[PDB]
Ligand binder design. Sequence first.
Ligand SMILES: *[C@@H]1O[C@H](CO)[C@@H](O[C@@H]2O[C@H](CO)[C@@H](O[C@@H]3O[C@H](CO[C@H]4O[C@H](CO)[C@@H](O)[C@H](O)[C@@H]4O)[C@@H](O)[C@H](O[C@H]4O[C@H](CO)[C@@H](O)[C@H](O)[C@@H]4O)[C@@H]3O)[C@H](O)[C@H]2NC(C)=O)[C@H](O)[C@H]1NC(C)=O
Ligand SMILES: *[C@@H]1O[C@H](CO)[C@@H](O)[C@H](O)[C@H]1NC(C)=O
Lengths: 49, 50
Amino acid sequence: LTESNKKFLPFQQFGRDIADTTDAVRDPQTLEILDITPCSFGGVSVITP
Amino acid sequence: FNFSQILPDPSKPSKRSFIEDLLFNKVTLADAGFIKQYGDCLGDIAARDL
Ligand SMILES: *[C@@H]1O[C@H](CO)[C@@H](O[C@@H]2O[C@H](CO)[C@@H](O[C@@H]3O[C@H](CO[C@H]4O[C@H](CO)[C@@H](O)[C@H](O)[C@@H]4O)[C@@H](O)[C@H](O[C@H]4O[C@H](CO)[C@@H](O)[C@H](O)[C@@H]4O)[C@@H]3O)[C@H](O)[C@H]2NC(C)=O)[C@H](O)[C@H]1NC(C)=O
Ligand SMILES: *[C@@H]1O[C@H](CO)[C@@H](O)[C@H](O)[C@H]1NC(C)=O
């Protein structure tokens, strides 16, 4: 969760991606916008003789 | 015969000719970098393109 610069309109609560997954949220206690980025992942290759 | 338009150009950082530069500029790649490396995608800015 990171601080974001998305200009949320006051009636808007969530942000959505192309695949309709949530990309940004509004914190309920403090009205601020948080970007959601998935944690670091990748492939692992083994190079051996 | 004049082959300066197809022989490599040493002034360019990559040794490509004039015609090869035109062929590379005319084809619009979506993303030819392949060097995103997950560090570019940490920041969610609208300049990030797909
Ligand atoms: C074999 O063929 C080559 C290429 O055809 C001839 O070499 C010269 O190449 C340049 C282009 O590389 C010809 O055009 C002139 O370019 C000058 C600027 O060049 C820069 O930009 C080009 C990309 O366009 C780069 O490749 C180059 O490295 C430079 O970074 C312009 O300033 C010139 O303008 C002059 O002429 C025009 C008329 O065409 C006038 O209107 C202008 O006012 C100005 O006077 C020009 O456009 C150039 O014509 C080629 N010839 C010469 C003599 O310089 C080789 O000469 C040729 N060799 C043989 C044996 O045939
Ligand atoms: C709930 O949290 C907000 C944010 O600090 C605060 O302004 C508000 O007073 C709180 N309400 C209650 C009932 O504690």
